[PDB]
């Protein structure tokens, strides 16, 4: 089965990845983003509600270690992680595991997050919220 | 999709930008004005009503930092920012993100703002209000 | 009788092993994984409930000696070991005796375990829990 | 193929260069002006319309670095550069790559530009516009 | 069979190489450029689309190690490499394996690339895009 | 019966060996490559599928002992070995027993393997995959 990827994904036009069809959730096995993917997946289990889970994902993109993310979880409950969305949205600010990997490699001090990535209504340092131009 | 720009815009006659048709709202991705654009967009969220939002935008054009603009917001609520108007009007005083970028680069101590950019009825230092010659 | 093996098993396409049919439980006689298999089988007897038995199996995969595993058993009761599942699931993280053998040979410091391998709800060092893509 | 050069060019009467015939566009390979040529070519791509491209070329002749010229471009689009005109006109003020090289070497604070080099209708510091005595 | 080479190639006028006829693809066995050739070929497999493959080739010419190029590939898929074009074009900026070898030997900090070598529309450090004077 | 050998084989033009006709499979009795041949044959029995058998052959060419190759086999089943192909292909990278013998004598740290020698789609250390110029 082919894994659906973002149109701007570097996996586009590759064997096992497609832009117009495929699986919408994946750990991206066989790529480097795989690691980031599973880390993001673990985050989405540590915080069941999407808002503060996305806040922790944004902090992860800003270079914060995943170990501190595990530390910040209120409980020690550990459940199996579901694969993160490979295409959360279709704009250039989609918080895919690939984009998070790229931001962590670039060590960016600020990121731009679209509205398809719901965040806490209060300010987050290094995160700028913009409208999602086009959604999934 | 092409992004509609001002007739006096430096993006006129370029790939992805047009004067007679295109998107009327954009963060101007791929340009420098992009940064100014998103900043202006954030301002338009900090002040929901257009009058004092435009006052803050005018102060932004006069060189005041965006950090102080965030400080001046009465609340800490942060919602996703909608793209600013690329063509608020068709005169030479259109408060486009490009014009704001140019004014900030020139470090102007006074600006001229047309009537298509609604402002508070009281005086604003460094801002002169004139009639908009032609509107959108 | 043919022994059913994982699709990613190195025993696939060999005499006595098959992917689409065969025995679902085996000590894998005639292979090296045999040893690991019987060790895993012994673990599954030392801990009757699958959760902490799988925890001990995960620790076994992380390089911990089987002698310490025997030491950690609360009782000295020793009953005959049933053959471990050759195909616990169909994803790439199936905790087959072959996969455990490969992980022990590679001396990995961290493993990824799918949801078809039930584990304790608390954190286990060196183990990352992910959803099983496809099950048996 | 011979490259057509200006009658006042120092490449006149040389192998591969001619005054009465030859290629009207060239990067001037094998000369020093080559570098200036390609820089001018890049300018002509950064600004698609000839007017502000010629303004940037005039600023380049006045000693301004090409890096700042790249900075001043509104977009980051980079397309292949076409060779600049070796003979834009036949007067002594022809803005050939050779003339630009000579002006940059002399570090002139003011230049005279003929009417065959279309410029913005507003004043440019250090540039004096005169009629082109004879054109191509 | 003779291998067609660039008119400016140092292999011109040699046994097994010709300018007017021959094979248009080769690993250049028997030469030093052979190594560069196969490296370039591997690059063209790592990035299936010609644009970012040519970007990686340009970075290779700028002295970046091939090991880092392998690292930068999003996937670990490795398919057989097709021989690179010995004559991608007929101008002096043809990105032949010989030219890449010469540039790597000279340790150049900047290269000039013609339009027959398609590159990403954004800026690449140390690469200047010019029109290809004559094509294949 | 004559044994068909590679055109670049040192057995070419010898009694019992020919380039245009002969047996396509042989243990190469009477030569030194004989030993390598039978070793390769044994490898082709240890791994029934050609892909990982060729991977093990490539590792054998890189100097790894045949005893470790026997150790790496998942099973202890030992069936009679069929003679390896004396001419797997007609290019210079043909993985003949003679070429493997030469590479082992030279103790090469890297080899180039054509596409007629199918290998695993993942990277193999010391092996570079290129297109086979001409096949059998
Ligand atoms: Zn979005
Ligand atoms: Zn107006
Ligand atoms: Zn599973
Ligand atoms: Zn003139
Ligand atoms: Zn060219
Ligand atoms: Zn071959």
Swiss-Prot record, chains A, B, C, D, E, F:
Phosphorylated by host on serines and threonines. It is a peripheral membrane protein. It is found in: Host cytoplasmic vesicle membrane. It comes from the Viruses. Zn(2+) binds at residues 89, 91, 114, 132. Signal peptide: none annotated. Seems to be essential for minus-strand RNAs and subgenomic 26S mRNAs synthesis. Displays mono-ADP-ribosylhydrolase activity. ADP-ribosylation is a post-translational modification that controls various processes of the host cell and the virus probably needs to revert it for optimal viral replication. Binds proteins of G3BP family and sequesters them into the viral RNA replication complexes thereby inhibiting the formation of host stress granules on viral mRNAs. In the N-terminus, the macro domain displays a mono-ADP-ribosylhydrolase activity. The central part called, the alphavirus unique domain (AUD) has a zinc-binding function. The C-terminus region, also called hypervariable domain (HVD), is mainly disordered and binds several host proteins. This intrinsically disordered domain contains 2 SH3 domain-binding sites and 2 FGDF motifs necessary and sufficient for the formation of nsP3/G3BP complexes. Interacts with mRNA-capping enzyme nsP1. Interacts (via C-terminus) with host G3BP1; this interaction inhibits the formation of host stress granules on viral mRNAs and the nsp3-G3BP1 complexes bind viral RNAs and probably orchestrate the assembly of viral replication complexes. Interacts (via C-terminus) with host G3BP2; this interaction inhibits the formation of host stress granules on viral mRNAs and the nsp3-G3BP2 complexes bind viral RNAs and probably orchestrate the assembly of viral replication complexes. Interacts (via C-terminus) with host NAP1L1. This is Non-structural protein 3. It comes from Chikungunya virus (strain S27-African prototype). The chain holds residues 1507 to 1642 of 2474 of the full protein.
């Amino acid at each position: 089965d082919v894994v659906r990827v973002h149109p701007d994904s570097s996996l586009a036009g590759r064997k096992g990845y497609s832009t117009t069809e495929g699986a919408l959730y994946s750990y991206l096995e066989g790529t480097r983003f795989h690691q980031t993917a599973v880390d993001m997946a673990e985050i989405y289990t540590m915080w069941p509600k999407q808002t503060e889970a996305n806040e922790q994902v944004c902090l992860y993109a800003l270079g914060e270690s995943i170990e501190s993310i595990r530390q910040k979880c209120p409980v020690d409950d550990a459940d199996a992680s579901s694969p993160p969305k490979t295409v959360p949205c279709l704009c250039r600010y989609a918080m895919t595991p690939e984009r998070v990997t790229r931001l962590r490699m670039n060590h960016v001090t600020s990121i731009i997050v679209c509205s398809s990535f719901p965040l806490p209504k209060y300010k987050i340092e290094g995160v700028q919220k913009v409208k999602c131009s086009k959604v999934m």
